Design an enzyme around this catalytic site. Structure first.
Site, mmCIF file in Angstrom:
data_model
loop_
_atom_site.group_PDB
_atom_site.id
_atom_site.type_symbol
_atom_site.label_atom_id
_atom_site.label_comp_id
_atom_site.label_asym_id
_atom_site.label_seq_id
_atom_site.Cartn_x
_atom_site.Cartn_y
_atom_site.Cartn_z
ATOM 1 N N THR B 1 -129.433 -33.189 -55.197
ATOM 2 C CA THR B 1 -128.517 -32.330 -54.401
ATOM 3 C C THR B 1 -127.574 -31.614 -55.365
ATOM 4 O OG1 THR B 1 -126.334 -33.286 -53.730
ATOM 5 C CG2 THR B 1 -128.286 -34.603 -53.336
ATOM 6 N N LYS B 33 -125.053 -29.854 -45.966
ATOM 7 C CA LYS B 33 -124.157 -30.588 -46.847
ATOM 8 C C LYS B 33 -122.777 -29.962 -46.980
ATOM 9 C CE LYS B 33 -128.228 -31.862 -49.585
ATOM 10 N NZ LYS B 33 -128.791 -32.000 -50.947
ATOM 11 N N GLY B 45 -117.890 -29.888 -48.654
ATOM 12 C CA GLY B 45 -119.305 -30.105 -48.906
ATOM 13 C C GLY B 45 -119.418 -31.547 -49.357
ATOM 14 N N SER B 124 -126.598 -34.141 -58.799
ATOM 15 C CA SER B 124 -127.523 -34.129 -59.917
ATOM 16 C C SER B 124 -127.706 -32.743 -60.533
ATOM 17 C CB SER B 124 -128.875 -34.657 -59.461
ATOM 18 O OG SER B 124 -129.387 -33.817 -58.452
#
Ligand SMILES: Nc1ncnc2c1ncn2[C@@H]1O[C@H](COP(=O)(O)OP(=O)(O)O)[C@@H](O)[C@H]1O
Lengths: 408, 174
Positions: B1, B33, B45, B124
């Site tokens: 994500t 998100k 978010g 990530s």
């Protein structure tokens, strides 16, 4: 308490009592003195005691009325005891301390009822919010714009507006409550519910004491009935006893009440007598001393009678008109009608036993017994009680003495 | 994500991709998100459970109600319980939150972090986004929204755990 001048007090008293100006000024000086005291220093505040009054006059001429309006005028605790009520204690009977107790139990029944006035808006303002919260369950942690909980005051204001009479819609709210119920109930169940929180204990009851000690007014009726008379001796010590028993109360002492320790040192005492058999100087020395003020009230005259009929606020005549209105009937008294009502009252009092102004209530009431009944079947009418009416209804009764002792 | 937030010319944004991964395969490709909070005044978010969110964001809203719109404070008060309350302690996540005032990151550790230029890049793919965002922001006149968007794509392009489904939430103030 009140800052009224004697002259202003007498004025205010003139609204309920006809004539008896002297007794009015006497009772007025007394009240003003209580104000005069608080305006002094430490020492002189203990030393200065009430100037107790001894009212002298025939039955029903305004003695008690004057003392009751005086009391009421100063929102003071008032008690009226009949002096002979203790002449039997030599065998048994109420102790005199009861006076200060009753003057307390009513000095409470007073602060209590008058704590329902001050708290009659709180349960219907910062407490009607109870139902409104179950009508529109407030947000999960209201935000905070001090107008945000005033915002609905659109959805909100609509619920409070529709709550101007529309209810009977069962819901539930909260030993809080929780229990499911209606609104002609949850709402009223809220009235007292949120009111017992505002009113506390050790101040409400603590205050009754404060009142009694500071503004208490004791009216000892027929003090003359406990004076010594030259008919016997055994019953005299009985009488003289009530005098000695009353002595602590007007000389200054402490009495025990299931509300606390009350001090009589500043209770105002208005004693009352006819003094036809005894004279004020037949009272024991110690009592005459504590009864510095002496004032006489005159017997009432036919003119006094006419004036008492209509002049006072909420006079029997006025009340009567009001009550007949309740029936949708318009009652009216012509001057000569009233002149005759008073006339009759005077006649019966002179021909039989004199009971002063009391006589007007029974005469007036008999006169109207017919309209009072038919009132409902006369709705929307203008009934005039004039001299003619008066005479047709009272003449026969007044003229007949034996009948007057029963019916008037 | 990959969650990217940027602020330029009275414009603040938060953009994210929609890939949820389990092992070496994609579970879902359109995860929202980036939401909105405090009566659509505060954007946010995140990276984590769909519930952890719906628990951490609801609370955050209240902290805002308990601190008159003052972003930071509620934020500080939030990361507070989040590292204290026995239960709350288990929720794992990375909230990115921003209002006209400022923007920042909250972490289960209770930290409240304000990045160099209200530039946030968590997840990530965070650094690849940061690198592309930083580039753009320093060498072009592009807009806060255009940045996060382009930055996000670059990310999903490098990051095997980030895709190209976006959920942007802007905010104008000036
Ligand atoms: N001077 C007066 N003015 C107005 N009402 C009076 C007067 N005298 C007597 N009354 C009426 O007669 C009744 C008699 O009681 P009260 O006035 O207490 O006198 P008393 O204590 O001498 O019997 C009262 O209810 C009152 O309404």
């Amino acid at each position: 308490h009140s800052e009224m001048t004697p002259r202003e007090i007498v004025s205010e008293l003139d609204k309920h009592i006809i004539g008896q100006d002297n007794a009015k000024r006497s009772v007025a000086i007394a009240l003003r003195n209580r104000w005069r005291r608080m305006q002094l220093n430490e020492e002189l505040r203990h030393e200065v005691t009430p100037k107790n009054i001894l009212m002298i006059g025939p039955t029903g001429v305004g003695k008690t009325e004057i003392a009751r309006r005086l009391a009421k005028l100063a929102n003071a605790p008032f008690i009226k005891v009949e002096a002979t009520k203790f002449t039997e204690v030599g065998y048994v009977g109420k102790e005199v301390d009861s006076i200060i107790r009753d003057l307390t139990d009513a000095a409470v029944k007073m602060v209590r009822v008058q704590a329902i006035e001050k708290n009659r808006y709180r349960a219907e303002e910062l407490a009607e919010e109870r139902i409104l919260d179950v009508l529109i369950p407030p947000a999960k942690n209201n935000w905070g714009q001090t107008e945000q909980q005033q915002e609905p005051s659109a959805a909100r204001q609509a619920f409070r507006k529709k709550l101007r009479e529309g209810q009977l819609d069962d819901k539930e709210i909260e030993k809080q409550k929780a229990r499911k119920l209606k609104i002609k109930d949850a709402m009223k169940l809220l009235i007292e519910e949120e009111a017992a929180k505002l009113v506390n204990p050790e101040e409400l009851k603590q205050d009754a004491i404060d009142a009694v000690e500071q503004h208490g007014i004791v009216f000892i009726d027929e003090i003359d009935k406990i004076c010594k008379r030259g008919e016997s001796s055994g019953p005299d010590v009985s009488r003289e006893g009530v005098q000695r028993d009353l002595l602590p109360l007007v000389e200054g002492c402490t009495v025990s009440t299931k509300h606390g320790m009350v001090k009589t040192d500043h209770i105002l005492f208005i004693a009352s007598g006819a003094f036809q058999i005894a004279k004020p100087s037949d009272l024991i020395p110690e009592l005459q001393g504590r009864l510095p003020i002496r004032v006489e009230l005159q017997a009432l005259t036919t003119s006094d009678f006419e004036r008492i009929l209509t002049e006072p606020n909420a006079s029997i005549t006025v009340q009567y008109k009001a009550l007949m209105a309740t029936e949708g009937v318009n009652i009216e008294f012509t001057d000569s009608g009233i002149k005759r009502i008073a006339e009759a009252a005077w006649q019966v009092n002179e021909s039989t036993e004199n009971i002063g102004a009391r006589r007007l209530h029974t005469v007036l009431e008999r006169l109207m017994e017919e309209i009072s009944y038919d009132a409902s079947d006369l709705s929307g009418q203008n009934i005039t009680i004039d001299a003619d009416y008066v005479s047709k209804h009272l003449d026969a009764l007044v003229a007949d003495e034996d009948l007057s002792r029963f019916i008037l | 994500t990959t969650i990217v937030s940027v602020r330029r010319n009275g414009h603040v944004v938060i953009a994210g991709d929609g890939q949820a991964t389990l092992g070496n395969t994609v579970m879902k490709g359109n995860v929202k998100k980036v939401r909105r909070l405090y009566n659509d005044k505060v954007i946010a978010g995140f990276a984590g459970g769909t519930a952890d969110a719906f628990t951490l964001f609801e609370l955050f809203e209240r902290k805002l109600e308990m601190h008159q719109g003052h972003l930071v404070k509620a934020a500080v008060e939030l990361a507070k319980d989040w590292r204290t309350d026995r239960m709350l302690r288990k929720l794992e996540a990375l909230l990115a939150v921003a209002d006209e005032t400022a923007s920042l990151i909250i972490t289960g550790n209770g930290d409240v972090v304000q990045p160099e230029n209200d530039l946030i890049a968590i997840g990530s793919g965070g650094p690849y986004a940061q690198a592309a965002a930083r580039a753009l922001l320093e060498n072009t006149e592009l807009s806060a929204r255009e940045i996060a968007e382009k930055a996000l794509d670059i990310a999903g392009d490098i990051c095997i755990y980030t895709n190209h489904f976006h959920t942007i939430e802007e905010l104008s103030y000036k």
